[PDB]
Design a binder for this molecule. Structure first.
Ligand SMILES: Nc1ncnc2c1ncn2[C@@H]1O[C@H](COP(=O)(O)OP(=O)(O)OP(=O)(O)O)[C@@H](O)[C@H]1O
Ligand SMILES: Nc1ncnc2c1ncn2[C@@H]1O[C@H](COP(=O)(O)OP(=O)(O)OP(=O)(O)O)[C@@H](O)[C@H]1O
Ligand SMILES: [Mg+2]
Ligand SMILES: [Mg+2]
Lengths: 432, 429
């Protein structure tokens, strides 16, 4: 069994502590450190803990044996991790657990022979530290696809990719992004659950290795005004009966009906999905015209950088690139929301709007309402109100998770709206 | 095959990452870092990337080199890539593809151009992690240590290059403080351009390791010598040097005169490519080793084009106008196209101005028909725009991007209020 293989790795690597890793509703990693003597108890009846932390009472941690990994930073004593699912004391799964929510939505898709594969493009910033505290000052003075010595973070990015490969992770490519100190690490495509586990691991690894070098890695959507913001472009494809359900060689543009319907479904609920995929108040400072980030609700081919883009590759690589999410979203909930909205498009038979190949930003406002082009929410409150009314996403994510998202977002918005920012003093104090 | 040899070097040296290297229209190196697991995919169907839309990187197997500075023992490697459209057609906007096209067109007439550049550069100090224009040493022409403090770093630069199949001739301290020169042997225009990009990357990387900043800027300091890229050039027809004619006067063939005549006819336009920055025209001023007047002569006078004394296989012309901030792929392509038009149409060059030129008065220079190189970047771009031969040789895509980038820089520079103006007028007016 897998448990026997875990204990073999324990004695070989001299693992003394195990971290029972899990995630709250906001995508923040949480854990319980246990000595290796308690590992047999963790894999058997499980470890008890207070679960008010998930919301961000008594519950149990159920480690997934497939996620056992030794943390490649040695302490002679090594450490290991285990991604755990949350269960209630009786044995039933906790429907407030984000990982359980994605698992449920994937099981509902598997009922119709569908499996969703996701391949995200993870953008992030590497900032300097001042007096032990993190800052928003770029550590390098680099640009798009730049090379060293312009890109000063080549050693740390090299370490991130190596540390990930040591944890059964396959990376496609990494490069410097448009903004100063911005970087991108694109992963290979995998099932929504393995990808979401991998997304959490990347954020943890990048932030840990950045600290080791006196730096701070952040996946914040818009840490600096006037420069490009970090996005999480999600390459998505559906696979029915082993074949790519988005490929039809006889149809026009070799795109199947299931693609156009899936696109139609996700665009129907995209205002509501934005509350999950763009959950911070800062996420809406990224959804501003002038940068790679999509703002208008449109879909097109590769030539135009729209919200949903259908790349040229065909065959087994047929896919859609949803470019609205940012890397601060909870990946378990982001993929669950996209899967539920996209499957409603396939099931309820929803035709998507006409593809817009013209440059949207170059068009005038007068032409956009003629074609029925909408806008993504401008504020967090505006997306939360749209999410509140979308009963499909509320039922797909569960009432417990949906309520927790609304409560956390409203608490942040009510605090942000009352604040007096420096911009207001700079604009009005001297004159008025 | 070469792919099998690459994978043998991978397991031998323990390469874990490879750099898919390429250059933009301005000669700046760009890359995509991939783990060694994706190397089979890169050498096969290629790696996709956003050029802005989407494109594919096609690595040149002959350019696979292990970076001598070891990784965390995880070795690292690099591959110079050609850009290509998704369907399979080479991208006409790629600078390396432009030189390759101009090379094939020369090869159809049995011609192969060999280039040997003299790379001048500066080594400056760093203040608070930012680069400065303060020389690291207070050395002069051909000076020796301890006057030349960069003797250890230059020795490391040459060593690192030799480890990557690089053959160099000599290195020395130049006229200005903290200025140096590294001259390497002659090779075909493509290998030389690849080597020029590698030289800049290696020097800047090694300088940062020592807390210094290497720069190939044409004129980083006012009042001192500027960095130049003197390009030794020669054509080879059917294995032999097309510039050597033992029966002709001065042992120089008609092909040399016609090639010189062609490059001097389009030299105003070539200046926009070989001297592409606004700062490049602060180097093209009298008083330093940089040529200003459009003339050609023997080794006695320092002119735009100089015919050195060596004959035989070493017969060549030294084009001294370029600076090391130019895109080498486009600089050599522009030289080859203008030079081949001279050969093809038999354009005679002007008389060799052996008389010392800077000392002559403007009135005489006007009588002899001696012209001048463009004084500003805008002036060179206007001349480049009208040169139909060069626009067609570099392609409309590349020519348009050069004009856009240069105009955007010029329009920003011309509106700026520099400190010189405040120092000259604020107190009095
Ligand atoms: N079917 C798919 N579903 C989701 N994402 C995909 C899919 N195919 C490709 N991608 C994403 O696109 C990126 C690269 O696209 P590409 O055109 O190379 O297809 P590919 O499947 O990655 O090719 P290969 O199988 O050789 O790796 C990958 O990083 C991956 O995340
Ligand atoms: N035929 C040629 N074409 C272009 N450049 C040349 C040629 N011959 C020499 N050069 C360049 O001129 C410089 C000085 O050449 P030199 O007088 O030493 O003759 P050389 O021995 O043939 O040089 P090299 O050893 O580099 O071939 C060298 O750096 C070289 O790159
Ligand atoms: Mg993208
Ligand atoms: Mg010289």
């Amino acid at each position: 069994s897998k448990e026997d293989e875990i204990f073999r790795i324990v004695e070989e690597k001299n693992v003394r502590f195990v971290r029972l890793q899990f995630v709250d509703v906001q995508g923040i990693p949480k854990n319980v450190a246990i000595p290796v003597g308690q590992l047999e108890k963790a894999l058997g009846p499980g470890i008890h803990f207070d679960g008010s932390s998930i919301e961000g009472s008594d519950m149990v941690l159920r480690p997934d044996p497939d996620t056992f990994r030794v943390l490649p930073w040695s302490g002679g004593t090594a450490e290991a991790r285990l991604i755990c699912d949350i269960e209630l004391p009786d044995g039933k799964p906790f429907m407030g657990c984000p990982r359980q929510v994605l698992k449920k939505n994937m099981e509902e898709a598997a009922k119709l022979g569908y499996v969703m594969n996701t391949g995200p493009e993870m953008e992030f910033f590497l900032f300097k530290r001042q007096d032990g505290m993190p800052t928003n000052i770029p550590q390098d003075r680099g640009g798009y696809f730049d090379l060293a010595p312009i890109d000063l973070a080549e050693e740390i990015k090299r370490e991130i990719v190596l540390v990930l490969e040591e944890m059964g992770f396959e990376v496609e490519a990494a490069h410097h992004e448009v903004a100063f100190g911005q970087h991108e690490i694109d992963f290979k495509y995998d099932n929504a659950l393995a990808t979401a586990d991998n997304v959490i691991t990347l954020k943890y690894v990048a932030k840990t290795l950045a600290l080791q070098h006196g730096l701070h890695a952040t996946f914040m959507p818009k840490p600096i005004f006037g420069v490009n913001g970090s996005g999480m472009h999600t390459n998505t494809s559906l696979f029915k009966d082993g074949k790519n359900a988005f490929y039809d060689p006889d149809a026009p543009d070799q795109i199947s009906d299931t693609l156009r319907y899936f696109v139609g479904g996700v665009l129907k609920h995209i205002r509501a999905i934005t509350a999950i995929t763009n959950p911070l108040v800062n996420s809406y400072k990224r959804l501003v015209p002038g940068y790679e980030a999509p703002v208008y609700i449109t879909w097109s081919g590769p030539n135009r950088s729209s919200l949903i883009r259908v790349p040229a590759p065909r065959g087994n690589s047929t896919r859609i690139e949803i470019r609205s999410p940012d890397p601060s979203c909870n990946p378990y909930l982001a993929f669950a929301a996209i899967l539920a909205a996209g499957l409603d498009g396939v099931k309820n038979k929803i035709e998507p709007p006409e593809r817009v190949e013209k440059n949207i930003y170059k068009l005038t406002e007068e032409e956009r309402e003629k074609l029925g082009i909408g806008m993504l929410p401008g504020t967090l409150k505006e997306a939360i109100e749209c999410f509140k009314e979308d009963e499909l996403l509320v039922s797909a994510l569960g009432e417990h998770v949906s309520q927790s998202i609304i409560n956390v977002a409203m608490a942040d918005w009510d605090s942000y709206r009352t604040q007096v920012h420096q911009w207001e003093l700079d604009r009005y104090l001297q004159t008025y």
